[PDB]
Amino acid sequence: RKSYTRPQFRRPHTYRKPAMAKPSNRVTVESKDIAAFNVIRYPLTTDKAMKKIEENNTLTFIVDSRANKTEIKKAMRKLYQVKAVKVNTLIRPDGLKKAYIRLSAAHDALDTANKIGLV
Amino acid sequence: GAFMYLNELWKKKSSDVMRFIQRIRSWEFRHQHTVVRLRRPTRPEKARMLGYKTKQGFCVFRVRVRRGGRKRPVHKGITYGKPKTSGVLGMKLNKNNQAVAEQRLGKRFGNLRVLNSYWVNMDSTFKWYEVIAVDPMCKTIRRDPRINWIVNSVHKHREQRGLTSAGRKHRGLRHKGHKASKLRPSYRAAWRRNNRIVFLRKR
Amino acid sequence: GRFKPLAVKKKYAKKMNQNKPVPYWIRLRTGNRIKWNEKRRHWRRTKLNY
Amino acid sequence: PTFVTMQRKKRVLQRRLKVPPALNQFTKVLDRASRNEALKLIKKYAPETRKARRERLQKVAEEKKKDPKKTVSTKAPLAVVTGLQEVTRAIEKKQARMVVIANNVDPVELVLWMPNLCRANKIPYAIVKDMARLGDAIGRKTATCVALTDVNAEDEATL
Amino acid sequence: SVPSTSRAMIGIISGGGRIEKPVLKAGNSFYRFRGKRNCWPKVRGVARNPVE
Amino acid sequence: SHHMKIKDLREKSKDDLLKTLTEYKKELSQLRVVQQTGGAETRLGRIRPIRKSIARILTVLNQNERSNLKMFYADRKLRCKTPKVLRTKLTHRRRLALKENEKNRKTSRQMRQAHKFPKRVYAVK
Amino acid sequence: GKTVLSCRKGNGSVYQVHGHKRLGPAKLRILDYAERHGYMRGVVKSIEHEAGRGAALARVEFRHPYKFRRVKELMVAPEGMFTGQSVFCGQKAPLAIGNVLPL
RNA sequence: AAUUACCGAAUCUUUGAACGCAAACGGCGCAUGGGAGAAGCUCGUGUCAUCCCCGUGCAUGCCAUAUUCUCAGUGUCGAA
RNA sequence: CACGAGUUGUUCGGAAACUGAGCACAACGUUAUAUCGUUUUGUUAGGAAAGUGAAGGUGUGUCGGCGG
RNA sequence: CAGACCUGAGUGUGGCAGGACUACCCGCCGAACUUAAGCAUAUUACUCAGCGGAGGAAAAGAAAACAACCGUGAUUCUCUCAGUGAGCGGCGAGCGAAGAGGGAACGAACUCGUUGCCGAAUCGGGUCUUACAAGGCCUUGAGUUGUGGCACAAAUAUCAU
Ligand SMILES: [K+]
Ligand SMILES: [K+]
Ligand SMILES: [K+]
Ligand SMILES: [K+]
Ligand SMILES: [K+]
Ligand SMILES: [K+]
Ligand SMILES: [Mg+2]
Ligand SMILES: [Mg+2]
Ligand SMILES: [Mg+2]
Ligand SMILES: [Mg+2]
Ligand SMILES: [Mg+2]
Ligand SMILES: [Mg+2]
Ligand SMILES: [Mg+2]
Ligand SMILES: [Mg+2]
Ligand SMILES: [Mg+2]
Ligand SMILES: [Mg+2]
Ligand SMILES: [Mg+2]
Ligand SMILES: [Mg+2]
Ligand SMILES: [Mg+2]
Ligand SMILES: [Mg+2]
Ligand SMILES: [Mg+2]
Ligand SMILES: [Mg+2]
Ligand SMILES: [Mg+2]
Ligand SMILES: [Mg+2]
Ligand SMILES: [Mg+2]
Ligand SMILES: [Mg+2]
Ligand SMILES: [Mg+2]
Ligand SMILES: [Mg+2]
Ligand SMILES: [Mg+2]
Ligand SMILES: [Mg+2]
Ligand SMILES: [Mg+2]
Ligand SMILES: [Mg+2]
Ligand code: NA
Ligand code: NA
Ligand code: NA
Ligand code: NA
């Protein structure tokens, strides 16, 4: 017999074969190059948004309400080839998420707005 | 063959040796769970007689039921209405304990089909029955012409509807003819037959 | 007050979106029966209580 | 663990209480030297395996196909009788010359009656220590009882 | 009578004489029962209604 | 018109379909900008054909992928690992129900009795 | 009629012990091997008051008989127990106030 | 490439028996595949730490099963 | 009333991430039936619920010291 | 020592159970208003409410059945038996069936255990045949603490050739 130095029996550790990765159960085709189009929906053109474009180098967008500030930065780089130094977000009382995106001093927000088409 | 000696031995439960064997087993069963899985039946001849086979897909479980009369679950034993319904301790369940043990096993393990059950042991506090269960998804069960009828969905939870041998017992289906005319095909069906108002079109 | 679950806020947002009058061109449809929004809500009349 | 405590307490309760002769006879086993000799004879006459039976039947089938008119006996070589049903028939019909019964069959009702049946039919019998050792002699995991109905001339003295 | 292997502590329990001081106030009883349980004040049975 | 024909989709390869999907997703996003900043109704009328073209591209890609994967898992050695999303749906009861082969099983005695006394065709004059 | 107050208290509910701010149950140390054969010497570390109890409680620190640690039992202090007093518990403990001995 | 009707091929957000853990929290994990990566490194190309995004597996119970998986028992043996 | 707008967080509040009066999933037991009971007086369950790992043996890399 | 068996665990792999629906059907649980010109037995009622469980039906069903005849012949259902010169009932209020007869339906019958004779001939799992074949080959994996085959009144061997 063995020797037990503890006053109660505990389950001994035995060999545990690890589970194998199963074949994928989701077989739909998802394109990585179109993800940013879901993250960024469309820009805003209100008086407040227009004011921030020329004074704060900031663009205003309606974004996916489940999106990340980090992901919005990545989407801005992918869709418009600009570097966002700061993203501020709020969920509007209507339910949509709005993002204030300040571009780096190297990029001109007004020029980016012209290329986007909001002007 | 060997069945006869086993069968006659179990007709002598009150003998000295069978009493000793049942006493040791009853002590062991007292220190086990309410529901316990077994590798083999305790009474193989009785299990086989009731439909058990030593085949992949057949399972045997021992179920413990508490002995005694049913107590009416009213607060502080306070009943209302007529004094005819005032009894608390002296009423008895209209179902037998074997059916209760089968229903306990069937409700706990919904993936199995209950086939039958049999008495194994009892003490002052507990009664034990061993219940035969069948896996409807087992390939051996599905391709066996003798048991694969239970795979069909009509037999799902047959023990809950009192269709087993114990269920038939307390429904009154052991008797035929004038002994069970008012209980056939069921008492509710007989009540429907005898109490519905018939309206012939031309009366 | 300040606090509410995002789920409560989203439900309040949808009720805001629904609280709109019937568009004028709806009344000009061939088999139109709608004149005014029968489910208009005012914050002082009926309480949503979310 | 609970199962550990219960299996030890079960042995205690079996020794403390009064055991009737029907159950008590299974604790008075055959001695070790005779038990080893008996199991050696059983192992010598162990039943043929699935493979060996299969090549024997295939050889019989080929001989039948080679000479369809001739008749080839399908009888298996002389071996011990194993299994509760077959051993019981051998004892009832008095073909068994010796019967070996395991002493640790659970449920014990399976073989509780066998020593009395052997005594009634005047068949020599013995009770041994392990169904596992009996199963090992016959090439199985366990064996409740094993009966010898015939041996070769060289093993007649040993029997 | 108790088994002789049962243990005991030498001496008397500390804090004796506690019940010798009159309480003098319902408030002192209130503080006394704050740490024990909800059993004070006590209403006499004759002051209740026969239903209860 | 920005209308992509289903016949040309079914001939395009996977990479070409993904490329076309990106172009139509991009152009749809540009139209969303027009929706915000007013815009001419002629440009706005392109939104629906473009959205439906995107659906057509995705339909072809998903139909092709499902067909290819069913072919791959049609292998007898690999059909036990087929994803449930690709197995036949039918109904919960029907998947669990006895098949005809299992339901028609007979004992050896039953088989012999059926052969010994088959049902006959007869008439009375 | 209605349930009497004495019966209602049996339900528990709002008539249970106000156990918050209590230090825990007061007991002697476990009757282990050391007590049955030799003795265990402890030190009284604090004399404390528990709400709902008139008697003072003593926290007595012992060494663990099998492990490298301390035990810190909690007992009902007899009259005269003081901080720093040595408490002897076991078969061989001397007859003195505060010690625990077999009867 | 009209539009209707029908149906075989598809899509099918958050959820709910709801089942990785929670929840007036659109929250937080353990594995395993990816994705994006302006710091650092290499020759703007590659690669990429922390951070971030996504797919799959992971409730409990039961049955079957193990190229015959890993173990426990002063249970019964048998060999040291 | 109609239309158009407004709520920007590494540090503020919550959560991630504490315990309290308490709650009751598991587990076990009970009940004809769980939609019942136990579940903090250090604390689940007759109760095998630890997958975490000190010193070591085996390879890689970062080092101090000797000899050649 | 090992090792085996028994009993019991951990993990991997392949599956199932969970909820909804619930008119009808099956198993439990189960009242009272009401009626008796009051009321307790009784009646409402083996009902409503409550908890479980199925299917396109369910349940029942191949005699330990009726009958007492010149006999009938699984079950279910219909007319009828019959509000009954049956019976039950403070024999009060009320309650209350069964066999037979005319019919509907019906190719309606089968399986196991046991017994006797056989004894792995069985089952899963790989693998091949266009095949997860009711097939061949292999397999200790299960199984002799017994899978399966043949015969038992609709019967009068099986077992080759
Ligand atoms: K806004
Ligand atoms: K009562
Ligand atoms: K309201
Ligand atoms: K249904
Ligand atoms: K009246
Ligand atoms: K209820
Ligand atoms: Mg914010
Ligand atoms: Mg406020
Ligand atoms: Mg108001
Ligand atoms: Mg509110
Ligand atoms: Mg044999
Ligand atoms: Mg008073
Ligand atoms: Mg008063
Ligand atoms: Mg309390
Ligand atoms: Mg969840
Ligand atoms: Mg919270
Ligand atoms: Mg207004
Ligand atoms: Mg608490
Ligand atoms: Mg408690
Ligand atoms: Mg405990
Ligand atoms: Mg259900
Ligand atoms: Mg009424
Ligand atoms: Mg009245
Ligand atoms: Mg009255
Ligand atoms: Mg009802
Ligand atoms: Mg029909
Ligand atoms: Mg049916
Ligand atoms: Mg009939
Ligand atoms: Mg008449
Ligand atoms: Mg009645
Ligand atoms: Mg009839
Ligand atoms: Mg058989
Ligand atoms: Na009542
Ligand atoms: Na009838
Ligand atoms: Na051992
Ligand atoms: Na508005």
PDB file of C-alpha atoms in Angstrom, chain F residues 7 20 42 60 66-67 78-79 81 83 85 87 103-104 109 122:
ATOM      1  CA  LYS F   7     -24.403  34.098 -64.942  1.00  0.00           C
ATOM      2  CA  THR F  20     -15.821  42.404 -57.004  1.00  0.00           C
ATOM      3  CA  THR F  42     -30.348  59.386 -59.773  1.00  0.00           C
ATOM      4  CA  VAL F  60     -22.559  32.609 -55.237  1.00  0.00           C
ATOM      5  CA  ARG F  66     -21.167  24.676 -49.260  1.00  0.00           C
ATOM      6  CA  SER F  67     -21.205  22.511 -52.394  1.00  0.00           C
ATOM      7  CA  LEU F  78     -14.433  11.468 -43.369  1.00  0.00           C
ATOM      8  CA  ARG F  79     -18.252  11.492 -43.423  1.00  0.00           C
ATOM      9  CA  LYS F  81     -16.752  14.105 -39.029  1.00  0.00           C
ATOM     10  CA  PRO F  83     -20.215  19.348 -39.592  1.00  0.00           C
ATOM     11  CA  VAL F  85     -24.417  22.532 -40.439  1.00  0.00           C
ATOM     12  CA  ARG F  87     -25.727  17.343 -42.603  1.00  0.00           C
ATOM     13  CA  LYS F 103     -37.434  -1.162 -39.044  1.00  0.00           C
ATOM     14  CA  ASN F 104     -37.755  -4.090 -41.487  1.00  0.00           C
ATOM     15  CA  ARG F 109     -37.848 -17.780 -37.703  1.00  0.00           C
ATOM     16  CA  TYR F 122     -56.680 -15.781 -55.651  1.00  0.00           C
TER      17      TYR F 122
END
